[PDB]
Design a protein around this ligand. Structure first.
Ligand SMILES: CCC(=O)N1CCC(NC(=O)Nc2ccc(OC(F)(F)F)cc2)CC1
Ligand SMILES: CCC(=O)N1CCC(NC(=O)Nc2ccc(OC(F)(F)F)cc2)CC1
Ligand SMILES: [Mg+2]
Ligand SMILES: [Mg+2]
Lengths: 547, 547
């Protein structure tokens, strides 16, 4: 009163259904004396097998037989048989995976952390060495990244409801009994909290629990809006660096395990533009590698225009796989990244497990008509022309990097950048403000992140991507006999007024088994505009087509 | 005359059995008119489906039906039926995977490169988009890393035996017809080489081919000794960096895909100490992550002694997985790394898919007797005592880093470092030479690599590993109730006179399903002493126990 810390039980609070509640169904299922299992589990109390397990004295595999023993003699003093195929191991395997994250609680945890609460899990638990231990390990990873602390009984050598562990909790939280909330499904584990003077909640059904927590903290926790996906903190990410050419080195951030997925951002962005997708796809069972594309961030940024034609760009990505020892990867790209991704499927399909683009359609080059012509053809591409002259587009873009991104990164219903008559107007920003408002799509902090990156090498490199029209076209014409017959998803964005969804309308001709996806009310900056639906669409497709 | 370049055909030279020789067996198998298939394949010559495919005009999946068509009309003008279940796709899938690397040829390539030949593959081949394309992709990766150039018909848009492609070959090799050798299974593809004035070899059986090559180059290629495994070039590796604590960042090198395998080196080494294992395990189907352990290389090296007790070391590696999104990894370690690896299995088994140590046994702490005592107990551990006093062991080790490694890294039958009476002698090197000879185990270059790394942070950090005896013991005693019941391999080295194989003799008591492995004539520096047998033993065990 008032609080600034929130502590969560695992079994039956952050994870449901609890293992003790499978313990119980088992009895009913097999017509066992009510509580037989539980008798054998709690057996010996503080000096028995189960407690030793929770303190890390012995392992779960070690405990299994001691439990089965106790079940014998619990069922001896009760005078009853034991079923043909009785396995404490099978019962506990089922229970342990049956248990999933309790989403609303986790969200509640997130909320409170977001408003500056120190969050911690206090959980009686064991050193798991069963052959199927990896599942609980996954669970525990997913959770722990969202908390300041994961205090586990077997790691600390103390157990709930033993006071020592609470003194240790307070100790770890650098906070006082009256500044802390502790929720648990077990009254016994609450009484101690109380005696130090802690706010406590007996977590029965989750919704009432949240009601108490809501009240006593004064923050809306129930019924609050759909929260964004998890976003990366750059300094907590694995940063990878692969040189692919004497003086070109590509950097990327990597997270997760399973089939390699290579994310490729558009102009003028950064691996950070995939912050919402990195955790989600990792969590869905993949190994995300989010690029700094050539010209950006910590990836190299050589001046020469040719060093950014699609061909050299693509060979380089091949090399990238080569040097990481990856025979393939599923390639997902957006804006410029999309185009490349398609051209990877067209030229190196043996290396592409699957291809995917957000917004960017696949258009075949017109062998007759040039591309400078084809671009002047549609007025909404005028900005492309303005970018041709080395040095002009950079001067403007670099002059106030904050202004620039603040001006670029806006939701469909927010715009400040018309894209037509830019050459004539004489600037991308000729008639946009010096200090633009902050979009709904990005915290001030997220903008500053991009500003830092772009101080490294400016816009020369990025703008060169637009400066190989004639070359890319010539190269592209080599592929005019081919089709894309590998798994490909196309993902159009209703309100992207430059990569318009109609531009993809014939893509099936060259990509006949193409699968589509589409986002209402979503602008050009797909990833940060609609991160949830992007994750849903992509994860879905990955699972269906990348296995 | 004399040559300095060697060019290899793929199908039927670097890879056997050739696809054309499965083409043939098929005919016999199904009682087809001799050459029916081949007629339909070569059909249309330079203007037919097959050539278009080799030039990259169309894809393999695109070609499949045109081929089946030609087979129809080849078998129409021949007046014959076609089998119930006729599939050009099935025949070519079988053939394409049936084909493996022809080892002796590849070795021959390696040799010649090792003596300063420019090596290249010139191969008629296709853009592979079949659903089972990944296999050929793997093959092609394995090969290409060992060559200066992989010139592929469909990538270049030219084909063997068209002169253009040879002009392009010479062009790419920056060399002249008379400085080049070209081997092929097809006479037609040789005649052109000849006309420019190239040395050529009709590759029939591999051994005669090598005989001609041997002669005309003047280097022994047949019958030469067992060549070492592939070693890493550090600048061609993916370098990863993960901060795990405010001012500690761990670096590692990463290669391959599949189940994560985390390599952990000993004192005083580097991820480079696994150079022979990195490629091999990657090639065997794994994702190697070779560490710079805390205190070494590009990993951080904080001064405090406590920052290197096993516990903080282990939590850090847990964090390491956490931040890379890996729920588990198989941990393999050597020397000090081994010990840690065991203590990871003991404390965090949910995170260890499997454990493995080279030389380092698992010994449980003696709860009664201290560890400083236990160490003075055996004379061959005297060096450990000498390392206790901060600053003394460093001064010696850092004074001439070349001398130091040159003195440390020696095969069993080479030694210059006795390890007993070091305190009394007053130095590790008190009676070893200023300029030691180069071991058989390491090129001058490989030594300099270590010297560079150790200029970063000296030996303070590394020596601290030896300086937490009392702490590690106290921690270790918490685990005295446990056993290791997860897959564990122990790998003893006959002639390691400090981590002696007998020291492991009771390990089965605490690790009951423990699997062993053993290396004759192999010293302390296992990895570089016996890299082949190490790869064989570890890959074997990984495949049996890490799946
Ligand atoms: C067929 C069209 C195609 O594949 N293209 C590749 C990707 C496409 N991308 C862009 O132009 N992106 C973009 C356009 C404008 C923009 O804002 C600003 F920079 F202000 F012009 C930011 C990004 C350029 C054309
Ligand atoms: C139970 C023994 C054990 O687990 N230990 C962990 C690993 C072991 N390692 C070493 O002492 N390695 C080693 C010893 C000596 C050495 O050469 C030199 F540094 F000169 F002394 C280089 C390396 C130290 C003791
Ligand atoms: Mg609970
Ligand atoms: Mg051939």
């Amino acid at each position: 009163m008032t609080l600034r810390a929130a502590v969560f039980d695992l079994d039956g609070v952050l994870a449901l259904p609890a293992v003790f509640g499978v313990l119980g169904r088992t009895e009913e299922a097999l017509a066992l004396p009510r509580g037989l299992l539980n008798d054998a589990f709690q057996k010996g109390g503080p000096e028995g097998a189960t407690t030793r397990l929770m303190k890390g004295e012995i392992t779960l595999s070690q405990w299994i037989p001691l439990m089965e023993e106790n079940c014998r003699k619990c069922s001896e003093t009760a005078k009853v048989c034991l079923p043909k195929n009785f396995s404490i191991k099978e019962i506990f395997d089922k229970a342990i995976s049956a248990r999933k994250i309790n989403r609303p609680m986790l969200q509640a945890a997130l909320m409170l952390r977001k408003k500056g609460f120190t969050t911690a899990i206090l959980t009686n638990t064991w050193l798991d060495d069963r052959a199927e231990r990896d599942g609980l390990a996954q669970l525990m990873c997913e959770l722990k990244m969202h908390f300041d602390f994961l205090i586990e009984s077997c790691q600390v050598g103390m157990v709930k409801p033993e006071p020592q562990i609470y003194k240790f909790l307070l100790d770890t939280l650098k906070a006082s009994p009256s500044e802390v909330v502790f929720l648990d499904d077990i009254g016994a584990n609450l009484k101690p909290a109380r005696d130090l003077g802690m706010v406590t909640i007996l977590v029965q059904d989750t919704d009432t629990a949240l009601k108490e927590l809501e009240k006593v903290t004064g923050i809306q926790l129930l019924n609050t809006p759909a929260p964004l996906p998890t976003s990366c903190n750059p300094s907590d990410m694995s940063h990878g660096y692969v040189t692919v050419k004497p003086r070109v080195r590509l950097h990327f951030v990597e997270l997760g395990s399973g089939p390699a997925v290579c994310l490729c951002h558009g102009f003028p962005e950064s691996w950070y533009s995939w912050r919402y997708q990195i955790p989600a796809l990792a969590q869905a069972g993949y190994r995300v590698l989010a690029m700094d594309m050539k010209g950006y961030g910590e990836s190299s940024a050589p001046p020469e225009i040719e060093e950014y034609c699609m061909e050299v760009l693509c060979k380089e990505m091949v090399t990238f796989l080569d040097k990481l020892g990856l025979s393939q990867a599923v390639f997902i790209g957006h804006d410029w990244g999309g185009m490349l991704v398609w051209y990877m499927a067209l030229f190196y399909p043996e290396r592409v497990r699957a291809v995917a683009s957000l917004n960017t359609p696949f258009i075949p080059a017109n062998p007759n008509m040039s591309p400078l012509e084809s671009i002047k053809a549609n007025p909404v591409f005028d900005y492309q022309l303005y970018f041709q002259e080395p040095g002009v587009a950079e001067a403007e873009l670099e002059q106030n990097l904050s202004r620039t991104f603040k001006s670029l990164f806006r939701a469909s219903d927010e715009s400040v950048l018309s894209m037509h008559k830019v050459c004539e107007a004489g600037g991308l920003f000729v008639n946009s403000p010096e200090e633009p408002s902050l979009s709904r799509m990005v915290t001030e902090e997220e903008i500053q992140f991009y500003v830092q990156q772009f101080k490294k090498s400016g816009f020369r490199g990025p703008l060169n991507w637009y400066r190989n029209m004639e070359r890319n076209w010539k190269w592209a014409c080599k592929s005019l006999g081919r089709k894309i017959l590998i798994p490909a998803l196309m993902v159009t964005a209703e309100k992207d007024f430059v990569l318009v969804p109609q531009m993809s309308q014939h893509m099936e001709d060259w990509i006949p088994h193409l699968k589509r996806g589409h986002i209402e009310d979503c602008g050009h900056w797909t990833q940060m505009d609609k991160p949830t639906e992007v994750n849903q669409i992509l994860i879905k497709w990955l699972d269906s087509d990348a296995r």
